[PDB]
Amino acid sequence: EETLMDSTTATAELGWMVHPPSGWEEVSGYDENMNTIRTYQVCNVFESSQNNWLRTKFIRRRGAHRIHVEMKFSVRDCSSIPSVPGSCKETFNLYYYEADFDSATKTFPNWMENPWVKVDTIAADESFSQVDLGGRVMKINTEVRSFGPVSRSGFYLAFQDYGGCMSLIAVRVFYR
């Protein structure tokens, strides 16, 4: 029902912090309806030791206690990446961190679980839409996860990659 943040509605660049700048990257990309939106992409499958974070802007709570996070995203399919090493991955983690004000900076909070709280490891389900951008297939999955109770002025989300190839197409944060 009630939206706290929708990346799909951005009237300009996201502006989300990425750490390191070599990992996630803001890129224009498609909706499910082929509307062109801002997305974040990471695909450092040819590099060891990948730990790439992306963090939203401060989202106000506006009275909510339980937060729902709807993610649209596309994973590439390690099988479908020519010459890829065996360490390739097909999931990302989601985290939140609450705060009393917009306290985030380049180095705070630490870029790691604790102070961030892990919501879940996110993977592609077997429900989907797939189209031929021919002949490359665009497959968009949808996953919802929720967390709470949430009590402070607001919060941040984080998305962490550790050696896969994917695009986070949309994040919709809502309550009730």
Binding site: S22, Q41, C43, N44, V45, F46, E47, S74, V75, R76, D77, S80, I81, V84, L133, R136, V137, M138, K139, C165, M166, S167
Partner: peptide, 9 residues
Amino acid sequence: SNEWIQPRL
């Protein structure tokens, strides 16, 4: 399969 997502180098 999402073959439009280019690796980095």
